Write an enzyme that holds these catalytic residues in place. Structure first.
Site, PDB file in Angstrom:
ATOM      1  N   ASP A  56       2.767   2.743   9.655  1.00 20.29           N
ATOM      2  CA  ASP A  56       2.529   1.871  10.808  1.00 20.29           C
ATOM      3  C   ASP A  56       2.443   0.433  10.302  1.00 20.29           C
ATOM      4  O   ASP A  56       1.365  -0.072   9.967  1.00 20.29           O
ATOM      5  CB  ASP A  56       1.268   2.301  11.548  1.00 20.29           C
ATOM      6  CG  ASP A  56       1.048   1.533  12.847  1.00 20.29           C
ATOM      7  OD1 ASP A  56       1.637   0.441  13.027  1.00 20.29           O
ATOM      8  OD2 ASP A  56       0.273   2.028  13.693  1.00 20.29           O
ATOM      9  N   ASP A  62      -2.274  -5.923  10.462  1.00 25.20           N
ATOM     10  CA  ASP A  62      -3.622  -6.160  10.965  1.00 25.20           C
ATOM     11  C   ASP A  62      -4.652  -5.939   9.873  1.00 25.20           C
ATOM     12  O   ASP A  62      -5.621  -6.701   9.758  1.00 25.20           O
ATOM     13  CB  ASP A  62      -3.920  -5.235  12.144  1.00 25.20           C
ATOM     14  CG  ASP A  62      -3.338  -5.732  13.435  1.00 25.20           C
ATOM     15  OD1 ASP A  62      -2.739  -6.834  13.449  1.00 25.20           O
ATOM     16  OD2 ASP A  62      -3.484  -5.016  14.452  1.00 25.20           O
ATOM     17  N   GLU A  85     -12.846  -7.697  14.801  1.00 21.99           N
ATOM     18  CA  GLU A  85     -12.245  -6.739  15.724  1.00 21.99           C
ATOM     19  C   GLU A  85     -11.754  -5.483  15.011  1.00 21.99           C
ATOM     20  O   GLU A  85     -11.722  -4.400  15.608  1.00 21.99           O
ATOM     21  CB  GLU A  85     -11.088  -7.401  16.483  1.00 21.99           C
ATOM     22  CG  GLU A  85     -10.708  -6.669  17.772  1.00 21.99           C
ATOM     23  CD  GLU A  85      -9.529  -5.734  17.612  1.00 21.99           C
ATOM     24  OE1 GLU A  85      -8.895  -5.735  16.533  1.00 21.99           O
ATOM     25  OE2 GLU A  85      -9.238  -4.990  18.575  1.00 21.99           O
ATOM     26  N   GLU A  86     -11.390  -5.597  13.734  1.00 22.88           N
ATOM     27  CA  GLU A  86     -10.817  -4.469  13.004  1.00 22.88           C
ATOM     28  C   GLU A  86     -11.862  -3.536  12.418  1.00 22.88           C
ATOM     29  O   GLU A  86     -11.497  -2.440  11.967  1.00 22.88           O
ATOM     30  CB  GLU A  86      -9.922  -4.968  11.869  1.00 22.88           C
ATOM     31  CG  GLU A  86      -8.902  -6.011  12.292  1.00 22.88           C
ATOM     32  CD  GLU A  86      -7.850  -5.466  13.231  1.00 22.88           C
ATOM     33  OE1 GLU A  86      -7.572  -4.254  13.157  1.00 22.88           O
ATOM     34  OE2 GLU A  86      -7.294  -6.253  14.036  1.00 22.88           O
ATOM     35  N   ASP A 106     -11.130 -12.198  15.303  1.00 18.23           N
ATOM     36  CA  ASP A 106     -10.065 -11.216  15.424  1.00 18.23           C
ATOM     37  C   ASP A 106      -8.964 -11.698  14.493  1.00 18.23           C
ATOM     38  O   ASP A 106      -8.381 -12.764  14.746  1.00 18.23           O
ATOM     39  CB  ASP A 106      -9.572 -11.121  16.869  1.00 18.23           C
ATOM     40  CG  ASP A 106      -8.463 -10.100  17.042  1.00 18.23           C
ATOM     41  OD1 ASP A 106      -8.230  -9.287  16.116  1.00 18.23           O
ATOM     42  OD2 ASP A 106      -7.805 -10.134  18.098  1.00 18.23           O
ATOM     43  N   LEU A 108      -6.012 -10.626  13.684  1.00 15.30           N
ATOM     44  CA  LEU A 108      -4.677 -10.538  14.266  1.00 15.30           C
ATOM     45  C   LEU A 108      -4.733  -9.566  15.429  1.00 15.30           C
ATOM     46  O   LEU A 108      -5.509  -8.611  15.409  1.00 15.30           O
ATOM     47  CB  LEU A 108      -3.650 -10.049  13.245  1.00 15.30           C
ATOM     48  CG  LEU A 108      -2.181 -10.451  13.433  1.00 15.30           C
ATOM     49  CD1 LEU A 108      -2.029 -11.943  13.213  1.00 15.30           C
ATOM     50  CD2 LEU A 108      -1.270  -9.665  12.459  1.00 15.30           C
ATOM     51  N   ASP A 109      -3.880  -9.796  16.413  1.00 16.16           N
ATOM     52  CA  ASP A 109      -3.736  -8.938  17.589  1.00 16.16           C
ATOM     53  C   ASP A 109      -2.358  -8.264  17.638  1.00 16.16           C
ATOM     54  O   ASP A 109      -1.703  -8.203  18.682  1.00 16.16           O
ATOM     55  CB  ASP A 109      -3.979  -9.746  18.858  1.00 16.16           C
ATOM     56  CG  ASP A 109      -2.995 -10.887  19.021  1.00 16.16           C
ATOM     57  OD1 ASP A 109      -2.502 -11.406  18.002  1.00 16.16           O
ATOM     58  OD2 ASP A 109      -2.694 -11.268  20.180  1.00 16.16           O
ATOM     59  N   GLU A 268     -13.173 -12.891  21.131  1.00 14.71           N
ATOM     60  CA  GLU A 268     -12.086 -13.321  22.008  1.00 14.71           C
ATOM     61  C   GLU A 268     -12.592 -14.292  23.066  1.00 14.71           C
ATOM     62  O   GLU A 268     -12.217 -15.464  23.033  1.00 14.71           O
ATOM     63  CB  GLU A 268     -11.391 -12.105  22.651  1.00 14.71           C
ATOM     64  CG  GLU A 268     -10.574 -11.267  21.653  1.00 14.71           C
ATOM     65  CD  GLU A 268      -9.993  -9.981  22.245  1.00 14.71           C
ATOM     66  OE1 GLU A 268     -10.632  -9.349  23.109  1.00 14.71           O
ATOM     67  OE2 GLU A 268      -8.887  -9.587  21.841  1.00 14.71           O
TER      68      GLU A 268
HETATM   69 MG   LIG Z   1      -7.034  -7.243  15.989  1.00 15.77          MG
END
Ligand SMILES: [Mg+2]
Ligand SMILES: Nc1ncnc2c1ncn2[C@@H]1O[C@H](COP(=O)(O)O)[C@@H](O)[C@H]1O
Ligand SMILES: Nc1ncnc2c1ncn2[C@@H]1O[C@H](COP(=O)(O)O)[C@@H](O)[C@H]1O
Ligand SMILES: Nc1ncnc2c1ncn2[C@@H]1O[C@H](COP(=O)(O)O)[C@@H](O)[C@H]1O
Ligand SMILES: Nc1ncnc2c1ncn2[C@@H]1O[C@H](COP(=O)(O)O)[C@@H](O)[C@H]1O
Ligand SMILES: [Mg+2]
Ligand SMILES: [Mg+2]
Ligand SMILES: [Mg+2]
Lengths: 323, 327, 326, 319
Positions: A56, A62, A85-86, A106, A108-109, A268
């Site tokens: 992936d 990420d 976020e991770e 965060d 990366l999104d 966010e």
């Molecule tokens: Mg993220």
């Protein structure tokens, strides 16, 4: 005079008579953002596809982006608690590297929409640790109002870093020829009223009636003024940055699969609300300013409506009518 | 076995027993795209802002980037010796290649969509369509008036989180990622096919007051599915390359439709609709004006507009059902 | 723990309890070096050769030595940390305007070796930093300090990769430029030169005009009296490249005097002194023959000095031969 | 009109009515050289030093050239300075060319950031036999193409073929080799000589006399300057652009020279001869030596024709 992120941050730290701890934090974060940008732009992908003879991928970017931010912040000696976020749990910096700042971010999104290659971003908010207890996830449970600095990096057609502090909002462009962030927009202020609205209208069936009426007013203005244009990338950094640059309104309200909202308050909603407020805009949950929400859980969600003050005020009038 | 755009095009040229002219065209276009990518990512902006004591930052920097991209594509295609007629979104008239540099091909392109795209910091793109000149007449704008069915190659470059080149030919659609460390396009998705049915629709819903009634009904069914299936998600970037590429990768539908005020749509047939329709059909998708396939329209003006609804076949066919209901 | 030049310089500034001025100077210098390095590696040359047609060429048309001087000059003025700037490229010292004035005096060679950049030989940037001592309004006289007064000096080498070598009171530290992210990464801390090496470096083509002490010493290297193995020879012709090889591998580098050139060729303020300061902070030596390079009191900002530098045992041995020709 | 390596090589192939095989070989080599340049300039070094919290260059460089040439479908035998035996290309990826190369010359001194380079020579296989090591045992005269990439202050690829010598500069902004000097010709006579004068005690007497002639000119002219980088690609490239002479003669540790005939001397001799220069062992032209060992060494003296002839004059006296 040309200005760079490094010079700007150092000069604001001198004006603030700071010790240099927050300066080192911001320098470390800028370095991480440059490294994330390189990876996002796929430098070295030829090696993964066998140029020298040897899952992936979106998840893995990420993970790498998380590792870059975590390692650069840990080694800044400026942080004590890191919320990502991770990561399910807050990360507690080891004692020998502990500083006084709490960082929520965060990195990366991508997981979702990096396969279509349009826009990813990094979002961060920086708090002074408030309690004297041994560090823990509770140190990240501060309202957005307590932020000392926040911003984001957009890895779009170019890489831009937006940094908001007490002094206001400043925009920097990454020059890839020299790996420097160049100051290109100083003391940015959002337009008082815009002509664009941004939200996922696929949730239309699940919207509360205040959102439905407000969006209907943008499409069918009761005064027969020209309707607003619509844009929705689906990546918060891209949609919020367009709102900052052109004005207008961005909405991620509560719906049915997400009655507390979908976006995450700590890394966010709060950073983006802080940027907006520092730029003369607004950011509301509907019931209160995003920055005033007192969080109880590091990954808790929040509804968010943000952007130009006249547009958010107009939404709030509709929302009050329905309350 | 690792594959680059250069090697891929050269090998397809050898399989077709080509003379090398189209191969040289595609090489030149690939170089132009790398140069646009470097400019779009703002290499050297420090010098614009006075790092060496010299400051420009003069006019509309977005317009200047569109014009530079146009000059890069024009110059690289002229110097390929493979083209005779160049139609660009940026130019009023077709450009006729000087006699000493004329080759066999006609190229229609939009070199960059910065000025027509408020989301241009999010993404911009280059779109192109390549034709063989069909007559021996002295070259003119008439040579670009071919239906998209006549394309020999078409595609786009997306300058997004990374730079990707999508190239469609008779052999199908292939996707290449630009490795900026070495300036090579690496083959990362081979013989790409769009999914039969998607879960996302893409259009500017701010036009909703002036929607054609078929568009209103179709989109109402995406948001409120009559069979109570899950609603489609919405996405709209406002850059055609970005919105079409998402449609290709994830499936779904993209609409820039006609209405009473714009009875022929807004997007341009030669260098927006036809290249994207060709990529879509080579990927097993569809692209319709509502009345016919985009690729079957015979153009009469190089800047003529066309409505376009494209994407996964089951979704386009569903739109045409609604379109027929209102016909 | 990974360390960048920016973090290193900032940390050394916090340690020394500085106000941040020197830190900003070094930051600005590091930014100029990255810009020079991008230009030296020929970023954008395709525009010069017409990729977008004839009209798409300001800074792109400047020769590299001109562009490099503009970059260092501008970045240093904008640091608000300097008051007097001396460059190989300008006859007179530049006095910074009062509103941009700081405490420091910077002598620099923006692109040494560019005379021969047409052959893609390594080139470099050389700098020495002084603090202003005088009471007066800043003038050219503030640059006339001996190398002993340096607060920092070093060089950037645009070789097979770009490296910045920074010498301060705390020693010599080497940073590799990572072009993927525009960051100088610390790769070698507190570098020390070898006590003795096996390479000598000078232009032997000019042997006919050699000083007799240089003649004898070079003969000892080629025909060792103790029948040891002869030294290897290396002469790039670019001072930064030859001095960096000398630092990394040990040995000796010579640009001495003859009677055609009684004071040598290299410039004291922005070539000899920075390299002498790096060498001493690394445990090496740098002499004119008669004294330490860093002890010479200059009377002219562009004055020349003979220089012999490298591993201590090698330079001591040269001094012996030189003292013999007293 | 601007030109690129890709467009230049393709057009020459169209002119020669090639099938595209040698074009694919040179395309693949060009890609490998850009990847070596990236690695030599240390892209990614921050990851090695822990920026994200946790191969040597000549091995990676060998892997890049080897894999790009194998996947070109254009080659059958590959000789590299890095591999003791010739690599034989598997039947499914086999073309007709034999390539001899040094993936990264000068690399063992890369810690001092010396200029390094890649050297290559391309031959066509003669026999109908199965490919083998013997197929790379050809004299330099049989070369169809040769050249080098120099990773110096900038990266440049010098390509020599029947049409002459052409120089391409790597623009790192776009990753394209841009043609910057066309049909290059070396100066008839230069003013620089290049050799490791540390071996003076072991010099053949002809070398000793020739070098004395450069320092003490017999003819009312100024002494030559000396340059010796210690990386052959750097010294030879300077010799090409400024004119002059480069020598690696027979010394005692290397009684038949130190440089390797197949993938150092031969390609540089071919570039020199195509540019109007010369390259001799002293006894014959480098390109005329028939090799018996893929890693055999050769003495080499090369550069401007008047300077090489002058050396040959001194050499023949002592011989
Ligand atoms: Mg993220
Ligand atoms: N580089 C900087 N930019 C902006 N504000 C700063 C900076 N450094 C310090 N400050 C302010 O000074 C306080 C103390 O700084 P420090 O001593 O670095 O923790 C911070 O919490 C900020 O309010
Ligand atoms: N590189 C290529 N990839 C795919 N098809 C090609 C290529 N080169 C040539 N062809 C086909 O062969 C025809 C003649 O090529 P050319 O002689 O190069 O104009 C083209 O119009 C294509 O149909
Ligand atoms: N970043 C730094 N690295 C090393 N020494 C420094 C640094 N900053 C300040 N110093 C020392 O502290 C002094 C005060 O300089 P200033 O930075 O102008 O206050 C300098 O002249 C140096 O001796
Ligand atoms: N790209 C090229 N540049 C120069 N000469 C070439 C090229 N391609 C082919 N040739 C010449 O034509 C021969 C046959 O090429 P090929 O069919 O590719 O093996 C080569 O061995 C060269 O003599
Ligand atoms: Mg356009
Ligand atoms: Mg100099
Ligand atoms: Mg070698």
């Amino acid at each position: 005079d040309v200005n760079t992120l490094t010079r700007f941050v150092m000069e604001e730290g001198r004006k603030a008579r700071g010790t240099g701890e927050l300066t080192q934090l911001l320098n470390s974060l800028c370095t991480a953002v440059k490294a994330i940008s390189s990876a996002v732009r796929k430098a070295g992908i030829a090696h993964l596809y066998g140029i020298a003879g040897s899952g992936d991928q979106v998840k893995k970017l990420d993970v790498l982006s998380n590792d870059l931010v975590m390692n650069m912040l840990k080694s800044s000696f400026a942080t004590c608690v890191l919320v990502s976020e991770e990561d399910k749990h807050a990360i507690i910096v080891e004692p020998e590297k502990r500083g006084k700042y709490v960082v929520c971010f965060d990195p990366l999104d991508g997981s979702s929409n990096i396969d279509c290659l349009v826009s990813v971003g990094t979002i961060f908010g920086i708090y002074r640790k408030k309690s004297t207890d041994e560090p823990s996830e509770k140190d990240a449970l501060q309202p957005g109002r307590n932020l000392v600095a926040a911003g984001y990096a957009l890895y779009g057609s170019a890489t831009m870093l937006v940094l908001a502090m007490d002094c206001g909002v400043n925009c920097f462009m990454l020059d890839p020829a020299i790996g420097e962030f160049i100051l290109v927009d100083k003391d940015v202020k959002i337009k008082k009223k815009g002509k664009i609205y941004s939200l996922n209208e696929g949730y239309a069936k699940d919207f509360d009636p205040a959102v439905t009426e407000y969006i209907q007013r943008k499409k069918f203005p009761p005064d027969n003024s020209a309707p607003y244009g619509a844009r929705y990338v689906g990546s918060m950094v891209a949609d919020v940055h367009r709102t900052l640059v052109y004005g207008g309104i961005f909405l991620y309200p509560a719906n049915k699969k997400s009655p507390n909202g979908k976006l995450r308050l700590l890394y966010e909603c709060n950073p983006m609300a802080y940027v907006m407020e520092k730029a003369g805009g607004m950011a509301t949950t509907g019931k209160e300013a995003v920055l005033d929400v007192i969080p109880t859980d590091i990954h808790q969600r929040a509804p968010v409506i943000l952007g130009s003050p006249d547009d958010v005020l107009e939404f709030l009038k509709v929302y009050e009518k329905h309350s």
